[PDB]
Design an enzyme around this catalytic site. Structure first.
Site, PDB file in Angstrom:
ATOM      1  N   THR F   1       0.862  -1.142  -0.185  1.00  0.00           N
ATOM      2  CA  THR F   1      -0.115  -0.043   0.166  1.00  0.00           C
ATOM      3  C   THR F   1       1.521   1.043  -0.152  1.00  0.00           C
ATOM      4  OG1 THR F   1      -1.742   1.313   1.798  1.00  0.00           O
ATOM      5  CG2 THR F   1       0.096  -0.219   2.570  1.00  0.00           C
ATOM      6  N   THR F   2       0.306   2.633   0.011  1.00  0.00           N
ATOM      7  CA  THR F   2       0.800   4.065   0.120  1.00  0.00           C
ATOM      8  C   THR F   2       0.293   5.028   1.002  1.00  0.00           C
ATOM      9  OG1 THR F   2       1.618   3.608  -2.119  1.00  0.00           O
ATOM     10  CG2 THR F   2       2.344   4.719  -1.210  1.00  0.00           C
ATOM     11  N   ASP F  17      -4.693   4.563  -0.117  1.00  0.00           N
ATOM     12  CA  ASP F  17      -4.710   3.982  -1.387  1.00  0.00           C
ATOM     13  C   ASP F  17      -6.236   3.021  -0.647  1.00  0.00           C
ATOM     14  OD1 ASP F  17      -4.502   0.908  -1.670  1.00  0.00           O
ATOM     15  OD2 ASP F  17      -2.379   1.725  -1.117  1.00  0.00           O
TER      16      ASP F  17
END
EC number: 3.4.25.1
Lengths: 242, 240, 204, 216, 201, 195, 220, 238, 213
Positions: F1-2, F17
């Site tokens: 993920t970010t 995200d």
């Protein structure tokens, strides 16, 4: 007199009172007298220690401990009880630091130690901690607090309180002192004269005064009064006690 | 019986005392006297050995726990022995984990913590042994007297046990030399103390005395009849 | 291949107001043949019978603990165990050891004690309960008996027709596998009589 | 800890005439990636002793919490005694040996130094308990790179000046950056002396690209 | 290792080399294989050397306790079974053991073989170790139940030297013991080279 | 993920995200990696989702306990310490990276990160997940000091947009939270709003 | 195996298959996958059938105890919290993929716990081996805030695409409808494929099988 | 009012005494007289049998037992209490011969046995142990690196090196006689003669072979209990 | 996934003379191809007539030494007597087998004086087996020190030689030459040597440097 009800701490009275904690009250009132005062930027502590025998070294049975770096420990009652309570409080502070990663607030530490001392009040196989102790600290982002916790388990907030054979006596002569404004420099003098006037010389003589404090004057760190300030406080006492 | 308040340690008197703790305190008053003195760099423990009969050996009252720390017992044999094994185990654990000797103050603090549990909790009898602790650490010699009330005191000297008030008042007469004395001087002072404890008909013989000395460079070494012989040769005669 | 370590073949059938349960008689290790008196079908009652498939010793252990717990329940209640309670009970007996599973896939069949409505059930190795209105098999011959009972079974099948159908199904299904075979025991149970038989199939 | 995720750079330790010098980078690196570049791997335990570390920063914070609790207890009893650098060395050895022996090791090559009673101590316990006292110590690839260099600068003269020691550790960090890819251009210097422990930093690196011009 | 112990009408002997190796390099050539656990009961050596020493010292403690509690000397069969059980609970996690329990008690001179695998087997002829087969061949060629004391000694030395000579993982010294109603006795210890000179001609 | 969270004068902005997959198949495209742990302290979760939610509920219970006993909201330091100890005590079994963002009256907006293995640290931008290996250069090139709420919003939008278009483990929507003395503002970017 | 779930304007509709397979051979064609937990909540399981069964009865019993102690109708957050706690307790050792959806005082809710023990609230979600086709339909034809009968045929064609795009699902369709005043447990909702007619009787009449021995035991 | 403190061992008298332990001490006087004497040549242990019936098997009644070949024992008190004590002592001596593979000194023997003793009021009795003080007084004698050594053990756990100690019903009188009959240079033969003289003066009946069990431990030989013929030889002189 | 045991080398030589025991080691502390420190003696004094020497996993070495000192401490406290060399040997066997299935990865060699003032050297297998010897080398160069000490000190494979006993200066020159050879032969050892002799008067020590390479 309650005979048949005060053999255990889990038995109430016909009037509805546990006589074990009342007997612990009695024991504390039959103990030494300790005063504490919270200054504007910290708290100070004072112990009246009786030298039962000159054979005892100075600093023996040290009574103004420090539970944490920023938390002191004044206590009156049984020295064995005092040390056991101090040890459990120190373990509690260390556990708080290990689990939560910052200094323990004085009110929270007082709540935890009061809960623990209560846990020894209401059982039958154990006995309530018959000693009353002081909690003092100074935090730059929280303030200064003082707490007296007796074997009854009640942790109430006192500006500056006393425990011992001169409870009411120290109340009378600490009420006349104005408190909330001056700092440790102008409070150590009052503490010294108060301790030196509450003590009785005709009976229970041979006492020495030891002092400790916490606050920004030592960077929020509890320590005994420095020897220079200690002798200065003693000099103000001997001048003021005339 | 108004003394139904002394059958277990977990009940308070109406006047706020634990009479069982007081009886434990008085228990060590039964054992033989034992007095300790400490110099600038040397601490001595001298005790009065007692024997069940003259046809048998005298009861040892000076116990070695570690090379730098030594103890003297006065009271129950069982409790004192248990405290001694506990002391030895803790001193070894300190040497193993920290490689430094157990501090005298720290050792006595853990002693107080250990012996408070019987005083506070139902079960184990209170440790009714009077312990005289003499060791050496960073700030020099220490003499610690652990009263069976789970309390301890930092003392210049102490005599605990039978007729120990005579030695107490002897030391009360003789503070003024304890600090500046060397080995022989402090040893003779302690011997005069016990002789004050001992009545007229008896004297400090070789089999009667036990001497334990610790210091900065000298380990806690205990002397016996042949070993106490040089130290008692410098001893004077009883002022009778 | 744990199933192949001992093998077996069981099948359960019901008809009109009667039940028929059949099981293999072979006992043998994964490669070698030893006996022919292994008991895969067990009486959980006068009209209740349970068929077991899995490791031989695991089969016997689960059967014995089942009999113990079932007699416990019967003594506690005093009533005949109604077969849906039996199916939930066997499912629990297998499942209560999920992390230590017994590699045993059993089967049950019977009738309702009150209305005499036949009931059969199927259980999985880790104990997945399952019930069919037609038929159920377990063992090493699952594919063949499954297929030919799909192609052979009819609903509402008469008792004599029920015996004939179970006999033909089990024999022609066991003709298609080797590790399970060499003698099959057939138990038809009706509310009036219990005729215990063993159909003559090949001894090979 | 059976799989190391976060590692530490080289921790250099040299005892000079007047105290002890430790250097390490802020490279909190998730594998090869420079995950963090501002984590202080060096931090003092008391006024007379201090410690830096390499390896997983997680167990390093476990350790600084535990040892800080021990030293605050030491100053809390008010007994005058402090953990002598021998004492921290012993505690680390026994504790981490026992931790390893139950197949949950502390993946940390550990550097411990101190200056007490006029005597300089410099200990190093590894990932697995091999510990000793020596004039010059280095961890990670430092043992490969700077430890020979410190040995060369000590074989003819085991004693080193404070400026000499500072420039030596600076040059060793320079060659570390030149020959190691697990270093960051920033290091903390810890100088524990008689007056106490002090932590400073950081400083950068300069590569003489004459290698680049005559490689062309 | 190589240990031979065979029973006859007069008693039982025991054989032992002295070579200790860790793989190829010989760790020691002065190893006492058979253990003098008890003055009337003898224990042998095989497998892990420290495992054997520890287990035999445990058994020695146990038989001393038994003879002090029951005030009667422990049977050889009882000792062998005790060894078997006390090592059995350790079976499966790394034990290496093979041992003969040899001694004379009220039921005649007894001999049982215990091992890490689990056999506690009695019998006349016991040979375990690297050169077990080499000793077995010579003994079974020469075993008679009627070996007289001097001839039993001679054939004992013959078979034991044959065993220590035919093997490649054996050497050093030789340990020989004999058991009788008054206990065991150290008979002789002949080296490989001196006994080589004696048995070459 | 970010999950990139960056603090500003007055608080901290945190974004993520909305992609959670079991293999190559996107299981859920509406995932929220910002779980409110308290009134003014939040968290950012990376790694195995179940572990992150479990430790989130555990620390929710613990700092709720602390806040109700002190009658005072917790500090970010205490919370981050709870995540640190929880991660370390299960680090042999925990595959989860947590960012502790939030604002407290004691100091202000604080970003604490506990990545894989349990580094209890603090920094300006805390980017996490499999998508945190791409925008690191992008943020280092676009790092400036003191982005206002609008400038912080644009930093988040562009950074997570590069993560979105460049990485296949970041998808769905972009969820933001702004924590300050006024309170907490939670906003969502979708459609033409994301650059 | 196919499990699907949507939220419509007023409540929840659940769709489950009926084919259960062990290995590569189907075990049963009409297994029940819509599991009774509460008179106001319902769950659908996937993965290890026995694990799904036992975890569903365990959570249903615990939740019934909870509701009876409270006296109020149980809420979805409570059920999913206990379900996820117990699923994570075993840390994926149980292969149980369950989807949880129901109606409480706060409104309709629908959660999906994967076998490892992670959950999320979704307006529309499916899992299983045939989750690909169902979720493709879920993006293709699904509409939010969408009425009851159109919810019914939406879920029916979604599960129909699941059965006709996957082997491990079909032969029946069963639906559970949740509403503040309605619980419709459609089972079967609509059979999609009935077994074909048998053209040839295999002639299993009497006397076709021989027997070894007879034994007669009367009862009752 | 002592009665509130005798009930239980964990009570303290106003005079600080352990009344349960004192009662256990006095319970030693219920046992038969045991006399041990220490000489340079060794130690000899003499005891009274107190045979209840002539049909008794004298081997069963054990007043002196062997903890190890180098050490000897004597008992006075409860038979079962001393049985557990002696079994523990033998287990301990084999524990030492295991750990250090040496013969463990008699002072350490009494140390370990006293460690089993004085454990009545110890929380480690949770698995199961004495809730009551052990009720037997022990007489340990033997030869170690310090030559012949005799130790007397007190049920309280106290031990003392004694040249000549007497325990049992006539401990006071036998001790008083040993006080003047003992000399430091006494030989083993004359010491054993004196011991039987004291027993004759002390024992309630005449001395015959079945009234005395006799033991000896010398540096030369191991623990030897006097046989019937040896007992007759040593008693015919007296 | 993890190695609890790392090789650290070392050489422990113990020659027990007629009325003395001479126990020797090299202070090189190095792992694999890296070197930690040239100053790390492998000789550890236990009591006035007994000195332990152990090689192997260095953490195991230090823990073993601390454990033996602790056991010595209880033995002195309880038995009031300093134990013999054989007692310490049985102690070593017991403590080493106490971790049998998690073996103490250390070569132990103990040298001291017997109760008659006689030399005592006990070769300790890391499994736990022990023997009484007059000489023993262990660690990394045991295989090469063994035969030279056999032919010169044990008088093995040599004839026409008087079975002369060992002396003080003779065995001293012996051990000095054998360590010069050991350092010059094995690359896994070097950087120092430590030699310790224990006899009736007590213990003595001496340090000689060696090749740095």
């Amino acid at each position: 007199i309650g005979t048949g009800y005060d053999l255990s701490a889990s038995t109430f009275s016909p009037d509805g009172r546990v006589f074990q904690v009342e007997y612990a009250m009695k024991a504390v009132e039959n103990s030494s007298t300790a005063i504490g005062i919270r200054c504007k930027d910290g708290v100070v502590f004072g112990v009246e220690k009786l030298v039962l025998s000159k054979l005892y070294e100075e600093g023996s049975n040290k009574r103004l401990f420090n539970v944490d770096r920023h938390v002191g420990m004044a206590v009156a009652g049984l020295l064995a009880d005092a040390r056991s309570l101090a040890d459990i409080a120190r373990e509690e502070a260390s556990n708080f630091r290990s689990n939560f990663g910052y200094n323990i607030p004085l009110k929270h530490l007082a709540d935890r130690v009061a809960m623990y001392v209560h846990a020894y009040t209401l059982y039958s196989a154990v006995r309530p901690f018959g000693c009353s102790f002081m909690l003092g600290s100074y935090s730059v982002n929280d303030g200064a607090q003082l707490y007296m916790i007796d074997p009854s388990g009640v942790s109430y907030g006192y500006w500056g309180c006393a425990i011992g054979k001169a409870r009411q006596a120290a109340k009378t002569e600490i009420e006349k002192l104005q408190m909330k404004e001056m700092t440790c420099r102008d409070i150590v003098k009052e503490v010294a004269k108060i301790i030196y006037i509450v003590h009785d010389e005709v009976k229970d003589k041979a006492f020495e005064l030891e002092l400790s404090w916490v606050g920004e004057l030592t960077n929020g760190r509890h320590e005994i009064v420095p020897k220079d300030i200690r002798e200065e406080a003693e000099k103000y006492a001997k001048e003021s006690l005339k | 019986f108004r003394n139904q308040y002394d059958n277990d340690v977990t009940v308070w008197s109406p006047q706020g005392r634990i009479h069982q703790i007081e009886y434990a305190m008085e228990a060590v008053k039964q054992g033989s006297a034992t007095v300790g003195l400490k110099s600038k760099t040397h601490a001595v423990l001298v005790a009065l050995k007692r024997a069940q009969s003259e046809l048998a050996a005298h009861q040892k009252k000076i116990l070695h726990v570690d090379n730098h720390i030594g103890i003297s017992i006065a009271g129950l044999t069982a409790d004192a022995r248990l405290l001694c094994n506990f002391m030895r185990q803790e001193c070894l654990d300190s040497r193993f984990v920290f490689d430094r000797p157990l501090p005298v103050s720290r050792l006595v603090s853990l002693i107080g913590s250990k012996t408070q549990i019987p005083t506070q909790r139902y079960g184990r009898r209170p440790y009714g042994v009077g312990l005289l602790i003499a060791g050496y650490d960073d700030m020099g010699p220490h003499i610690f007297q652990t009263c069976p009330s789970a309390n301890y005191f930092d003392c210049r000297a102490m005599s605990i046990g039978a007729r120990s008030q005579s030695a107490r008042t002897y030391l009360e007469r003789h503070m003024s030399e304890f600090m500046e004395c060397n080995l022989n001087e402090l040893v003779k002072h302690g011997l005069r103390a016990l002789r004050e404890t001992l009545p007229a008909e008896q004297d400090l013989t070789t089999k009667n005395v036990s001497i334990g000395i610790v210091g900065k460079d000298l380990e806690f070494t205990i002397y016996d009849d042949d070993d106490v012989s040089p130290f008692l040769e410098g001893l004077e005669e009883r002022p009778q | 291949s744990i199933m192949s370590y001992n093998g077996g073949a069981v099948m359960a059938m019901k008809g009109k107001n009667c039940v028929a349960i059949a099981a293999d008689r072979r006992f043998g290790i994964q490669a070698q043949m030893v006996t022919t008196d292994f008991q895969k079908i067990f009486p959980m009652g006068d009209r209740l019978y349970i068929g077991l498939a899995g490791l031989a010793t695991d089969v016997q252990t689960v059967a014995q603990r089942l009999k113990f717990r079932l007699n416990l329940y019967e003594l506690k209640e005093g009533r005949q165990i109604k077969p849906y309670t039996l199916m939930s009970m066997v499912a629990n007996l297998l499942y209560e050891k999920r992390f230590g599973p017994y590699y045993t896939e059993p089967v049950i069949a019977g009738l309702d004690p009150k209305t005499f409505k036949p009931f059969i059930c199927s259980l999985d190795l880790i104990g997945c309960p399952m019930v069919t209105d037609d038929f159920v098999v377990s063992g090493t011959c699952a594919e063949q008996m499954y297929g030919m009972c799909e192609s052979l079974w009819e609903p509402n099948m008469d008792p004599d027709h029920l015996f004939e159908t179970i006999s033909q199904a089990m024999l022609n299904a066991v003709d298609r596998d080797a590790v399970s075979g060499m003698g099959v025991i057939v138990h038809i149970i009706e509310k009036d009589k219990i005729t215990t038989r063993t159909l003559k199939a090949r001894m090979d | 800890t059976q799989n190391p995720m976060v590692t530490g750079t080289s921790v250099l330790g040299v005892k000079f005439e007047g105290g002890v010098v430790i250097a390490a980078d802020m490279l909190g690196s998730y594998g090869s990636l420079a995950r963090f570049r501002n984590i202080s791997r060096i931090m003092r335990v008391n006024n007379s002793t201090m410690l830096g570390a390499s390896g997983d920063y997680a167990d390093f914070q476990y350790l600084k919490q535990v040892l800080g609790q021990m030293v605050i207890d030491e100053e809390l009893l008010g007994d005058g005694h402090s953990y002598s650098p021998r004492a921290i060395h012993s505690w680390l050895t026994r504790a981490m040996y026992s931790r390893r022996s139950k197949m949950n090791p502390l993946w940390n090559t550990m550097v411990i130094g101190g200056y007490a009673d006029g005597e300089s101590f410099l200990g190093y316990v590894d990932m697995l308990g091999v510990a000793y006292e020596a004039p010059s110590l280095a961890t990670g690839y430092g043992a490969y790179l700077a430890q020979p260099l410190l040995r060369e600068v000590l074989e003819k003269q085991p004693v080193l000046s404070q400026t000499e020691a500072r420039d030596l550790v600076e040059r060793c960090m320079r060659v570390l950056y030149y020959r190691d890819a697990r270093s960051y251009n920033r290091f903390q210097i810890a100088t524990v002396t008689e007056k106490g422990v002090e932590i400073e930093g950081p400083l950068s690196t300069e590569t003489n690209w004459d290698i680049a011009h005559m490689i062309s | 290792t190589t240990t031979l112990a065979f029973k006859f009408r007069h008693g039982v002997i025991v054989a032992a080399d002295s070579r200790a190796t860790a793989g190829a390099y010989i760790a020691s050539q002065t190893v006492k294989k058979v253990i003098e656990i008890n003055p009337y009961l003898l224990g042998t050596m095989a497998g892990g050397a420290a495992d054997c020493s520890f287990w035999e010292r445990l058994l020695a403690r146990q038989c001393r306790i038994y003879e002090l509690r029951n005030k009667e000397r422990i049977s050889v069969a009882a000792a062998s079974k005790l060894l078997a059980n006390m090592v059995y609970q350790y079976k499966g996690m790394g034990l290496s053991m093979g041992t003969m329990i040899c001694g004379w008690d009220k039921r005649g001179p007894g001999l049982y073989y215990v091992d890490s695998e689990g056999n506690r087997i009695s019998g006349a002829t016991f040979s375990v170790g690297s050169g077990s087969v080499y000793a077995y061949g010579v003994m079974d060629r020469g075993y008679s139940y009627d070996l007289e004391v001097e001839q039993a000694y001679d054939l004992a030395r013959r078979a034991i030297y044959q065993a220590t000579y035919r093997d490649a993982y054996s050497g050093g010294a030789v340990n020989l013991y004999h058991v009788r109603e008054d206990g065991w006795i150290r008979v002789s210890s002949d080296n490989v080279a001196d006994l080589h000179e004696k048995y070459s001609g | 993920t970010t999950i990139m969270a960056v603090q500003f004068d007055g608080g901290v902005v945190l974004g993520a995200d909305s992609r959670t997959t079991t293999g190559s198949y996107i299981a859920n495209r509406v995932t929220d990696k910002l779980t409110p742990i308290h009134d003014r302290i939040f968290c950012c979760r990376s790694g195995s989702a179940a572990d992150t939610q479990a430790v989130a509920d555990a620390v929710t219970y613990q700092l709720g306990f602390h806040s109700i006993e002190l009658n005072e909201p917790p500090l970010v330091h205490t919370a981050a310490s709870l995540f640190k100890e929880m991660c370390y005590r299960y680090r042999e079994d925990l595959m989860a990276g947590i960012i502790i963002a939030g604002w407290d009256p004691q100091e202000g907006g604080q970003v604490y990160s506990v990545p894989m293995g349990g580094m209890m640290v603090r920094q300006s931008f805390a980017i996490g997940g499999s998508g945190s290996s791409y925008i690191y250069g992008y943020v280092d090139a676009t790092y400036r000091e003191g982005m206002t709420k609008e400038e912080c919003l644009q930093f988040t939008a562009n950074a997570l947009a590069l993560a979105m278009e460049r990485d296949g483990s970041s998808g769905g929507v972009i969820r933001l939270a702004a924590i300050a003395e006024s309170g907490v503002e939670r906003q969502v970017l979708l459609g033409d709003q994301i650059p | 195996t196919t499990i699907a779930g949507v939220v419509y304007k007023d409540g929840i509709v659940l769709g489950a298959d009926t084919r259960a397979t062990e290995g590569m051979v189907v075990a049963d064609k009409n297994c029940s996958k819509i599991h009774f937990i509460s008179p106001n909540i319902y769950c659908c399981g996937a993965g290890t059938a026995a694990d799904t069964d036992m975890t569903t009865q365990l959570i249903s019993s615990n939740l019934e105890l909870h509701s009876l102690s409270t006296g109020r109708l149980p809420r979805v957050v409570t059920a999913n919290r206990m379900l996820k706690q117990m699923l994570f307790r075993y840390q994926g050792y149980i292969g149980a993929a369950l989807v949880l959806g129901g109606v409480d005082v706060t409104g309709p809710h629908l959660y999906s716990i994967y076998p490892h023990g992670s959950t999320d609230k979704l307006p529309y979600v499916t899992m299983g081996s045939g989750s690909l086709a169902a979720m493709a339909v879920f993006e293709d034809k699904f509409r939010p805030d969408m009425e009851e009968e159109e919810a019914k045929n939406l879920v029916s064609e979604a599960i129909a695409a699941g059965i006709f795009n996957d082997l491990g699902s079909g032969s029946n369709i069963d639906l559970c409808v949740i509403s503040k005043n309605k619980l419709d447990f459609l089972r079967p909702y609509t059979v999609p494929n009935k077994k074909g007619t048998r053209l040839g009787r295999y002639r299993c009449e009497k006397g076709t099988t021989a027997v070894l021995t007879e034994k007669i035991t009367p009862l009752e | 009012t002592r009665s509130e403190y005798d009930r239980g061992v964990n009570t303290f008298s106003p005079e600080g005494r352990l009344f349960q332990v004192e009662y256990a001490i006095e319970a030693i006087k219920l046992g038969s007289t045991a006399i041990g004497i220490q000489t340079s040549e060794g130690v000899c242990l003499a005891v009274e049998k107190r045979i209840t019936s002539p049909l008794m098997e004298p081997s069963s009644i054990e007043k002196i037992v062997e903890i190890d070949a180098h050490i000897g024992c004597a008992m006075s008190g409860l038979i079962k209490d001393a049985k557990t004590l002696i079994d523990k002592a033998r287990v301990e001596t084999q524990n030492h011969w295991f750990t250090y593979n040496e013969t463990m000194t008699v002072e350490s023997v009494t140390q370990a046995v006293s460690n089993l003793a004085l454990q009545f009021g110890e929380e480690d009795a949770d698995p199961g142990a004495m809730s009551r003080p052990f009720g037997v007084a022990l007489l340990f004698g033997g030869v170690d690196e310090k030559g012949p050594q005799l130790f007397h053990m007190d049920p309280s756990g106290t031990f003392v090196q004694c040249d000549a100690r007497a325990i049992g019903s006539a401990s006071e009188g036998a001790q008083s006689s040993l006080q003047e009959v003992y000399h430091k240079s006494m030989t083993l033969k004359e010491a054993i003669k004196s011991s039987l003289i004291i027993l004759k003066q002390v024992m309630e009946e005449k001395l015959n072979a079945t009234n005395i069990e006799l033991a000896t431990v010398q540096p030369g030989q191991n623990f030897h209990m006097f046989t019937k013929e040896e007992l007759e030889e040593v008693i015919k002189d007296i | 996934r993890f190695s609890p045991y790392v090789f650290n080398g070392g050489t422990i030589l113990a020659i027990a003379g007629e009325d003395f025991a001479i126990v020797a080691s090299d202070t090189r502390l190095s792992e694999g191809f890296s070197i930690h420190t040239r100053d790390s003696p492998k000789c550890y004094k236990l009591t006035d007539k007994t000195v332990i020497g152990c090689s192997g996993f260095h953490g195991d070495c230090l823990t073993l030494t601390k454990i033996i000192e602790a056991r010595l401490k209880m033995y002195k406290h309880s038995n009031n007597k300093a134990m013999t060399t054989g007692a310490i040997a049985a102690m070593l066997s017991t403590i080493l087998y106490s971790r049998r299935f998690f073996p103490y990865y250390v070569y132990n060699i103990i040298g001291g004086l017997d109760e008659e003032g006689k030399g005592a050297v006990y070769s300790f297998d890391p499994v736990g087996s022990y023997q009484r010897d007059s000489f023993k080398a262990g660690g990394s160069a045991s295989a090469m020190l063994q035969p030279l000490l056999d032919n010169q000190v044990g008088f093995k494979n040599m004839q026409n030689v008087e079975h002369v006993p060992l002396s003080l200066d003779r065995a001293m020159r012996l051990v000095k030459d054998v360590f010069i050879s050991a350092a010059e032969r094995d690359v896994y050892t070097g950087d120092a040597l430590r030699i310790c002799i224990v006899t009736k008067e007590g213990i003595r020590e001496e340090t000689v440097s060696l090749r740095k390479d």
